[PDB]
Amino acid sequence: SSSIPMPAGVNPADLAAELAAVVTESVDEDYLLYECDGQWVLAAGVQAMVELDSDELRVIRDGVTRRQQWSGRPGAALGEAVDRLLLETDQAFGWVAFEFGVHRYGLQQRLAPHTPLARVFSPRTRIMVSEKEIRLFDAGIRHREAIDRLLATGVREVPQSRSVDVSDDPSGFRRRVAVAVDEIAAGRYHKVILSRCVEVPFAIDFPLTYRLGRRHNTPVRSFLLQLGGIRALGYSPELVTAVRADGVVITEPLAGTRALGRGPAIDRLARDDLESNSKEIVEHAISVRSSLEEITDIAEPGSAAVIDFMTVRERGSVQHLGSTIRARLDPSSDRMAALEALFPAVTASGIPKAAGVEAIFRLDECPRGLYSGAVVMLSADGGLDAALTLRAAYQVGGRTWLRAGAGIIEESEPEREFEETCEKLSTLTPYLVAR
């Protein structure tokens, strides 16, 4: 565990993303870059991988695949495997699918064979980039050498971006929204979040796109990854779960959206609209009530509280009403139970949860996979940090795509909901670097 001062001209996000690119170039390894409270943590190389699927748990290390069957809660299975990783390393990193959340609501029967639930690895090396210093954990001579070369050449200039059209509706989001509105009017549920994919018809450079978008966003967490054939990046607007080593558990429901980034006065008009708009206030209050009910399932009695209520949270191309809910983890619970209790995020699924999540199987493109799941960083001291995976781009096989959604309630209209998806997609769409 050594350290290097940070060069002077240079932003931690830019240097961390460039490192991720340099190390791909040199050593051809998987990685996950996770930004958490001014630390850009590059988890580089896979020492061991835990793959949780609907029908199997695998642990893979140094060639060898151990296969195990599992029953009961997916969080119990994942927790057993991850807690073992964390005997050998201080931190473990990866992603949790939307589909991980469905067991709690009696929907396990619906997942196809081999449906991914989670991928969580211990890195070979961590490099931690912050405003002051670069810290190196377990870096090998080959890696330090290429860090030293990066510092010698400086960061690349980011090229001009290349645009994508989001105005088309190949998946029939507007039709699908109308179906949900009819269901809500008939009393099937109160709210469902539906979404649409947007295809990117060219290959993107994930690290350079990560850098360009980061200059134009203010997320709670961010990530850039290449793991098991998936490339992804995103600017997470809210925590679905964080669990501190001291047992404090946080969740951050966001509900109510307007555009941001359109000019200071226009943005202020929108803010004032949002903060005073009864429809948005009511749905925000309802969302907080639901999140509180969820966190209360894992909380020490009397410990669940709203610590920040209905405040505007600026997130690049959009601004939201947000709250922050806290509790103390009951001694009878654990970090994975806490995740499960809050999964999938109420503000990315629906209310009531079981009916809303089921509507998503019927009325959205499934599996959702990474989208509306979480990107996660777990620590040996008990920590769990789980950023909700929204405002993200993905590449798997020859397919590169974006995905965004909107909360549909009884008085929703397909046009305004499609536009809200455009607003959210604009977190990324002006910032796509080809290659």
Measured CA distances, 251 to 248, 341, 357, 369, 394 (Å): 10, 11, 19, 21, 25
Ligand-binding site membership of 38 (annotated): no
CB 403 within 8 A of CB 424: no
Ligand-binding site membership of 391 (annotated): yes
Q: How far apart are CA 351 and CA 293, in angstroms?
A: 12
AA letter at 400: T
Neighbours of 358 (CB within 10 A): 20
Neighbours of 28 (CB within 10 A): 7
Ligand-binding site membership of 293 (annotated): no
User: Is the CA virtual torsion 259, 263, 266, 268 positive or negative?
Assistant: positive
Structure tokens at 429: 């769409």
Q: How far apart are CA 352 and CA 191, in angstroms?
A: 7
Q: How far apart are CA 4 and CA 130, in angstroms?
A: 11
First to last CA, the chain: 34
Ligand-binding site membership of 369 (annotated): no
Q: How far apart are CA 180 and CA 360, in angstroms?
A: 10
Measured CA distances, 243 to 101, 130, 239, 318, 382 (Å): 17, 22, 11, 27, 8
Ligand-binding site membership of 257 (annotated): yes
What lies within 8 Å, CB to CB, of 166 at 6+ separation is 198, 402, 421, 422, 425, 426, 429
Q: How far apart are CA 271 and CA 259, in angstroms?
A: 9
Catalytic site includes residue 410: no
Ligand-binding site membership of 20 (annotated): no
CB 366 within 8 A of CB 221: no
Ligand-binding site membership of 99 (annotated): no
What lies within 8 Å, CB to CB, of 364 at 6+ separation is 176, 194, 195, 405
Ligand-binding site membership of 431 (annotated): no
Regarding the domain delimited by 1-435, which CATH topology (the fold level of the hierarchy) does it fall under? Anthranilate synthase (3.60.120)
Structure tokens at 360: 């998503």
Nearest to 338 by CA among 382, 285, 289: 382
Sequence spans of domains, the chain: 1-435
Neighbours of 243 (CB within 10 A): 26
Give the pairing type, strands 191-199 and 399-408.
antiparallel
Question: H helices of 89-199, where?
Answer: 141-153, 173-185
Ligand-binding site membership of 406 (annotated): yes
Nearest to 256 by CA among 202, 315, 304, 204: 315
Ligand-binding site membership of 75 (annotated): no
User: How far does Cα 143 stand from its chain's mean position?
Assistant: 28
Cβ-in-10-Å burial (0-12, 13-18, 19+) of 43 comes to: buried
Q: Among residues 35, 238, 252, 280, which one is catalytic?
A: 238
Structure tokens at 340: 């499960």
H/E run at residue 30: none
Ligand-binding site membership of 405 (annotated): yes
Three-class secondary structure of residue 349 per DSSP:
coil
